[PDB]
Amino acid sequence: MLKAVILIGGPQKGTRFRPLSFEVPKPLFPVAGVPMIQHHIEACAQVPGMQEILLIGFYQPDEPLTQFLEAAQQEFNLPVRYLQEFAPLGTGGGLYHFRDQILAGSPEAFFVLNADVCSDFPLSAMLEAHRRQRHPFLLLGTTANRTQSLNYGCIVENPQTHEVLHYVEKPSTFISDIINCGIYLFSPEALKPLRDVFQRNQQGTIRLEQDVFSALAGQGQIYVHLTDGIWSQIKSAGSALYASRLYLSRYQDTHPERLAKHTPGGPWIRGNVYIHPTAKVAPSAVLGPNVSIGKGVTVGEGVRLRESIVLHGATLQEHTCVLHSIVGWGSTVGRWARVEGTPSDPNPNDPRARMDSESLFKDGKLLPAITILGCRVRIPAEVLILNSIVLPHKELSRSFTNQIIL
Amino acid sequence: MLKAVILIGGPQKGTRFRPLSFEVPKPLFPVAGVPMIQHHIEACAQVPGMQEILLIGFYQPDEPLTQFLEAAQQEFNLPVRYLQEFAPLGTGGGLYHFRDQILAGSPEAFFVLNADVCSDFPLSAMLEAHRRQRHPFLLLGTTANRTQSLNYGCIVENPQTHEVLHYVEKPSTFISDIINCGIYLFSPEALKPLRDVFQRNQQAGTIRLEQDVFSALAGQGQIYVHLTDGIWSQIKSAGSALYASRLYLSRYQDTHPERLAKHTPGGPWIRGNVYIHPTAKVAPSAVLGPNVSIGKGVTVGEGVRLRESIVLHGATLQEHTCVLHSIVGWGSTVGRWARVEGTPSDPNPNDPRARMDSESLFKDGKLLPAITILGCRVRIPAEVLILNSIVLPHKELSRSFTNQIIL
Amino acid sequence: MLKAVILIGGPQKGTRFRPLSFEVPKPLFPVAGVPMIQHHIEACAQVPGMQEILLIGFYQPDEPLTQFLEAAQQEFNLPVRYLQEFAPLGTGGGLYHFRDQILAGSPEAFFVLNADVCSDFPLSAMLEAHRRQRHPFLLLGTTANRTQSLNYGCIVENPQTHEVLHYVEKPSTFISDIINCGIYLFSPEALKPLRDVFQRNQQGTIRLEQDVFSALAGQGQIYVHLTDGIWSQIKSAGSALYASRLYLSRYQDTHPERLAKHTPGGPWIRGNVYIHPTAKVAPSAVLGPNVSIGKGVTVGEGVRLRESIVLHGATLQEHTCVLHSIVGWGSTVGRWARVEGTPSDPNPNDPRARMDSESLFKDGKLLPAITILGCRVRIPAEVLILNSIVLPHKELSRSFTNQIIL
Amino acid sequence: MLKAVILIGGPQKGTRFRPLSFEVPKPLFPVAGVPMIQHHIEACAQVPGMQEILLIGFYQPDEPLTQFLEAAQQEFNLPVRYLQEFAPLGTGGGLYHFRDQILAGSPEAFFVLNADVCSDFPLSAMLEAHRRQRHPFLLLGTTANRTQSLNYGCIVENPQTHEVLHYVEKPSTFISDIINCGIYLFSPEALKPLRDVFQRNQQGTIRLEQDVFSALAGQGQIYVHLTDGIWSQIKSAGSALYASRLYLSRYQDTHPERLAKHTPGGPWIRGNVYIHPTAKVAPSAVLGPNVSIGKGVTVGEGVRLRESIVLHGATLQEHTCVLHSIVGWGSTVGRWARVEGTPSDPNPNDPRARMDSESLFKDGKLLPAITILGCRVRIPAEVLILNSIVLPHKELSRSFTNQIIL
Numbered sequence A, C, D: 001m002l003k004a005v006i007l008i009g010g011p012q013k014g015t016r017f018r019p020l021s022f023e024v025p026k027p028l029f030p031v032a033g034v035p036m037i038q039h040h041i042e043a044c045a046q047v048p049g050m051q052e053i054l055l056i057g058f059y060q061p062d063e064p065l066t067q068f069l070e071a072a073q074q075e076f077n078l079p080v081r082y083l084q085e086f087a088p089l090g091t092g093g094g095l096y097h098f099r100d101q102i103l104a105g106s107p108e109a110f111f112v113l114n115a116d117v118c119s120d121f122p123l124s125a126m127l128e129a130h131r132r133q134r135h136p137f138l139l140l141g142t143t144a145n146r147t148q149s150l151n152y153g154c155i156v157e158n159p160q161t162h163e164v165l166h167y168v169e170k171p172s173t174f175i176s177d178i179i180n181c182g183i184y185l186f187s188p189e190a191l192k193p194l195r196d197v198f199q200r201n202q203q204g205t206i207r208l209e210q211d212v213f214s215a216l217a218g219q220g221q222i223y224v225h226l227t228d229g230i231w232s233q234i235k236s237a238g239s240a241l242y243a244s245r246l247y248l249s250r251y252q253d254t255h256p257e258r259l260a261k262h263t264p265g266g267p268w269i270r271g272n273v274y275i276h277p278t279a280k281v282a283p284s285a286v287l288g289p290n291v292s293i294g295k296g297v298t299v300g301e302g303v304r305l306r307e308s309i310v311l312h313g314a315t316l317q318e319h320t321c322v323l324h325s326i327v328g329w330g331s332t333v334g335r336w337a338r339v340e341g342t343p344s345d346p347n348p349n350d351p352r353a354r355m356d357s358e359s360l361f362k363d364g365k366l367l368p369a370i371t372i373l374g375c376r377v378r379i380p381a382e383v384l385i386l387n388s389i390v391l392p393h394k395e396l397s398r399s400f401t402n403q404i405i406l
Numbered sequence B: 001m002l003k004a005v006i007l008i009g010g011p012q013k014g015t016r017f018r019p020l021s022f023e024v025p026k027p028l029f030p031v032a033g034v035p036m037i038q039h040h041i042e043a044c045a046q047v048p049g050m051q052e053i054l055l056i057g058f059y060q061p062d063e064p065l066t067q068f069l070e071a072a073q074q075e076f077n078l079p080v081r082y083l084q085e086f087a088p089l090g091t092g093g094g095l096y097h098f099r100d101q102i103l104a105g106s107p108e109a110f111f112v113l114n115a116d117v118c119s120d121f122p123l124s125a126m127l128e129a130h131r132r133q134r135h136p137f138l139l140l141g142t143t144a145n146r147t148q149s150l151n152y153g154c155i156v157e158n159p160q161t162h163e164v165l166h167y168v169e170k171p172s173t174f175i176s177d178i179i180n181c182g183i184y185l186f187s188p189e190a191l192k193p194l195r196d197v198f199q200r201n202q203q204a205g206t207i208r209l210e211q212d213v214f215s216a217l218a219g220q221g222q223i224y225v226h227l228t229d230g231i232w233s234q235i236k237s238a239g240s241a242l243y244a245s246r247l248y249l250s251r252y253q254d255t256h257p258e259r260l261a262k263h264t265p266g267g268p269w270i271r272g273n274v275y276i277h278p279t280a281k282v283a284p285s286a287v288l289g290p291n292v293s294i295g296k297g298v299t300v301g302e303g304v305r306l307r308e309s310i311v312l313h314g315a316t317l318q319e320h321t322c323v324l325h326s327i328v329g330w331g332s333t334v335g336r337w338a339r340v341e342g343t344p345s346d347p348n349p350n351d352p353r354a355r356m357d358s359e360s361l362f363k364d365g366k367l368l369p370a371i372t373i374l375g376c377r378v379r380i381p382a383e384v385l386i387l388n389s390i391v392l393p394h395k396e397l398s399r400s401f402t403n404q405i406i407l
């Protein structure tokens, strides 16, 4: 038997995902219709031998997290527990702090997944490689562009034994095309270096990449497993859109009943579109590629929706165009209003993609990105929101362009 | 018997041109050490015969609002009540909706005061002009620059009798250089035209006071002006509040000489006018430049240079930091050798009586360089420059930011 | 042109409904399936000429109240406005304070409705009796039992013209057997006495019963309209149970699709039972008379449910017996656990009924009434909760009998 | 070098016997004027060598507990740290789970204190007994009656070497007069038997008294240090009033500036009375024995206060008699109002006897005990509140006797 540890963050790691995170926690943001960690729990309960799923984070258990945990426990036939760490303990410090609960029942190995990644999660093939080799650390790696790889944790390996010889968390200079994916397979022996790291701290917070992956690289403990299935990070509020698009593309294999079909008496559907059943979509509303509709969403007639997330309880009145946007919970977009953004994906194989920095401005100018509307934002009739971020509970009366509307 | 009505706004109507804060209500923001409406309440409770003080707004009753009401009631031994509207009723709709509460006790007159002004508040001078005149609407007006007069309520008066003949609220072309200060003396008959505006609509109860009652009743012998020479500013932006802080710390030299910070050469070096709370800990090596206001429980380390800044309560500035032109929010930490700097929004010093322009956070799609705002519980790391940035509340930074809005 | 003023209270009004008012406000408590005031709103929106519904209370407008407001505005196609008062102004002082908002549009008349009452709401009959004579106050009245009438507002009338000669709010002896129903029809002239009352307090708070009805009774202003329909007050937390019984009896005539039908496929039912469509009920559940089931309720195989109210998200495991109880939101009753109460209907006509005090204890013993479980109370297996009150978020381990579990 | 673990509870633990106060946590309740665990932190920081104080519990960190931690760190010049358990873990499971934080820095011994005890805390005496023999467990023992000891953990000791030969936690018939006090002194080897318990549950929650003390008794690890200082459990509200009395008696010998002297320009003061400096007490108020006033309390002219606690912000108007009560914070008692409770104190006929904790309900009947007025409870003028429990945010309007007013 095995178990999974999904490292969800806490409220400080959700600061970068801020317009969206004001209402829900970041790991519960619905990416292609289901919350962000439900893709992880989906992929982990698909593995034969999964006993437990242990979320580690420093979120307080509010109503949405505990209701999600009970819903995941019923839907996925597993005990899904939430281990709240007493302090922000870094990446590996919460795995070392909870080692008695992780190793309870003596699992053969355990997965360690970052909650902010979108992946196909090739957990079975990682397990095949681990049961072949039996090493302390198995990392998942992807190939990136040489220019984009500097935004990520670079891995220099040995292409015959697949041993990580070098690891650097964000190098200024080129190191390697292999980037860490935030998916790991630890054996129980892997909790013995972390102990050492913690003991060296006494002369509690352990960063897994800077203190364990970069230290034991080349000593025989850390190994790679490569893929090139889908992979994305979700850091800012608008990388949720790229993650949603990748997931809606892989629903063509894993859940094709989530994807909506045209059915000539209904709304006109291009590309991959998720529509929740509670949503009412008018038959003249064409829903373009990579759209996901939340529950309780009333989409009026003639509404064009392309490359967007419309969250729960939102309302798009007649003849609206919503492109590359995230319409928040309960937001209302009046008739002939245009909410337009600019596509900006992380995409580590795109040589023109931005670094996904925390600074949204270059020199006073807001860089063109996804248009985020917070919850309860009333966009008036006949008005354009272009490349803007609107903070929650803001009733607007005016056209806004390249602005953060506080 | 006189009473006072302070029109405080509400959660959406604040519309912060560049935010002073995010989590405390805008009337309770400390300008020159004390909350923005406590200057109004001091000025009103100094007036003899003033019985009651009413705050009309549509803020929900949170805890800071209630504890400020109790603190003001205890400090001035006046009733200070908060009449909350069922909706945003505009500038005159809350006066018409609460006219039985306003006119209970039968006052001789009532002062209507905008919450977001910094004023000398010559309430006895307006009171004496009105006791000589006995007119329905008396307005305090100042003198504006010709270019900047278009942002305020402009007044064509008659200079012999001091009667408003024409009123435009926010013009596009110049009509006058007299501007409405936002301070009014109302007779108990001034509620009688407000009713008329309501009955023009009912043929709910929103009445813009300046656009419906002042713009349309001018020239009819009903509105009169009282021209003043003292300090006056509008407090809308963050730089507008730093300017109001400078004006009020100037006026503290002859109203509250105990409130300013003297040198005390065992203690911190004081340049200019500085307010320090008695509970704040300021290390003796820290030099505190002009127009600095320190809240309660603020810890200031050694060698801290504070110049033209508001440091709200609970904030900790560690050693060797430089905070200039900033509003360090409550509970915010600035670590060693960090520099939190903003750009001053100073009036045009070549021109007579330029008041202030309030920056609108974006000029033409570009972010404007202005005051640096740190939100509540913002952590600035050691050895980091924050320049012209707004850091949203509860955000631990890790690098130097320049001309950002860090969410 | 008519409108309706529904006097919902505030939190101090709803403290008498304490186990259940921790979660939702009292007017939004679901009685026979829908919230308490949606009965009033639906019964006003069938009056020809009804143009506005105003809710006057001192509840702060949090998320559930404005969700209810928008949902009713869409469901009944009427403007449902909420008028929050600056201070708790009594029963009539909030009508006097909001007079310009009520008298807007020059309405012919307006119905004042207390939120706590359960009624058939005979609004058209009061309307016709008003249009025949046009008096300042029309009161709705019922005949009570001579013993029970001392607990209510008694109206001494003249039996010919039906004009009030006397009003006493809580009598000491028998004054009359006609009691005040909390349903009123006001002409626009009715605010001319209220103003007088307000001025008499200056040389704000106005009790409509004690300051307006007690004074103008016998002076030719107040008239009565006797009715025979179902009438109840919902003061205590378990008078909602008797109200839901009366409303589920009215549902046979007014909304017959809300009741459940005996079918081979699902559970078998005796008497009037409301089951929500999103509620999963097992076929071996026997849902006895006067039972309301909320959305998301799982009712296990073998559950006996009789004279109860189950609320949204609650779980009853197999073989449980729930009788005369109210099961709060998300509560869990484990298997073979029995949640029993004693019927305690307010019942003015009945001569046996309790006086409905705010006490609940007689001589140190909790008087036997409805067993209320609060929000998310977890009840273990094989345990008895008999005549008890469990405050919310309690995980019991024991049998409890005639207690309050704090 | 030593440190001190105080085992504060969590929200489910410690609310059952009676409610001292509904809103602030049980460890933050002011017993004799200062919070309940400030007596522990006082006694612990007064011990030479004490480097840290840890608070192990499962309360979520809110502004009361965080603000108290800041205040205590500032006052006592120690680091005072709250360690939140991820789950309720028992009285030994939190000690074992946070063993890397407790044993960090090499303490030579650490105290473990139950948060709900009144004691003089002879920590230097226990430390002198431990520095002379260096055993894994040192327990504080008191003597109890031969019918009260069934309610405590009983210790059969050796009269000469003071070694526990038997431990029983809640016996059914009489075992020993020596009872466990909830004050322990652990050596760093004492976290080695705890690990031995933990693995034996593998085939996290560790009870200290039932798994560690009761099963290692007689092997050479658990010893006793007998005393006869002040001692009490603080479980119910009568327990809190009595522990306030014991601490106010000890304030004569330790903090004599806390007790209130006469000051003939002030109130009349009988017995031991703590008054906060920020409180406002009229000169005509007679403050009887064992009263403690919180901060910002206005006390009117002619108030009688006897055997009572008045929390921060409460106003008692003129001529009120508050006897044997806890007036919660922000409460208001009107003119000529009586708030009375009945004390079921220690036996007058037995020297040995402790305080029995009543359990809110005995023999199906609500017991006459301390009157608890909750937070912002408004008691009207000329109203008697006898033996009642008024739940928070309640305005009453009449007299009540032997109730729980919801």
Ligand SMILES: Nc1nc2c(ncn2[C@@H]2O[C@H](COP(=O)(O)OP(=O)(O)O[C@H]3O[C@H](CO)[C@@H](O)[C@H](O)[C@@H]3O)[C@@H](O)[C@H]2O)c(=O)[nH]1
Binding pocket: B007, B008, B009, B010, B013, B056, B057, B058, B085, B088, B089, B090, B091, B094, B113, B114, B115, B116, B117, B151, B152, B153, B154, B169, B179, B180, B181, B182, B210, B233, B234
């Ligand atoms: N009760 C209530 N108060 C309000 C509302 N809206 C604004 N207020 C408060 O009423 C005052 C009026 O502000 P604004 O309506 O936003 O206009 P303004 O830009 O401040 O202009 C007014 O004051 C200027 C002086 O600074 C004048 O120049 C101008 O003529 C006008 O009087 C402010 O204190 C505002 O907070 C409302 O809907 N209800």
Ligand SMILES: Nc1nc2c(ncn2[C@@H]2O[C@H](COP(=O)(O)OP(=O)(O)O[C@H]3O[C@H](CO)[C@@H](O)[C@H](O)[C@@H]3O)[C@@H](O)[C@H]2O)c(=O)[nH]1
Binding pocket: D007, D008, D009, D010, D013, D014, D056, D057, D058, D085, D088, D089, D090, D091, D094, D113, D114, D115, D116, D117, D151, D152, D153, D154, D169, D179, D180, D181, D182, D209, D232, D233
């Ligand atoms: N961290 C943590 N602390 C806890 C937990 N459970 C209880 N505590 C704290 O541990 C202390 C006592 O534990 P209890 O087990 O609830 O106490 P008791 O049954 O009433 O009796 C205890 O004290 C008596 C003397 O006061 C003793 O006789 C007895 O042996 C035991 O220590 C209290 O401060 C309680 O808040 C827990 O799960 N986790």
Ligand SMILES: Nc1nc2c(ncn2[C@@H]2O[C@H](COP(=O)(O)OP(=O)(O)OP(=O)(O)O)[C@@H](O)[C@H]2O)c(=O)[nH]1
Binding pocket: A007, A008, A009, A010, A013, A056, A057, A058, A088, A089, A090, A091, A094, A114, A115, A116, A169, A170, A209
């Ligand atoms: N449980 C838990 N998870 C965390 C914590 N910190 C980070 N994580 C998770 O692990 C991922 C790592 O994020 P970061 O802490 O930013 O580290 P990084 O991805 O290597 O990038 P850098 O910021 O350059 O260090 C986060 O996206 C979270 O999913 C933590 O303190 N506790």
Ligand SMILES: Nc1nc2c(ncn2[C@@H]2O[C@H](COP(=O)(O)OP(=O)(O)OP(=O)(O)O)[C@@H](O)[C@H]2O)c(=O)[nH]1
Binding pocket: C007, C008, C009, C010, C013, C056, C057, C058, C088, C089, C090, C091, C094, C114, C115, C116, C117, C209, C235
């Ligand atoms: N808006 C508003 N509504 C109120 C206020 N007080 C009561 N109400 C509502 O109006 C109705 C009258 O309340 P009650 O005074 O309790 O009715 P009652 O039957 O005369 O009195 P009791 O049953 O003895 O408590 C109730 O439905 C309340 O919800 C108030 O101050 N403001």
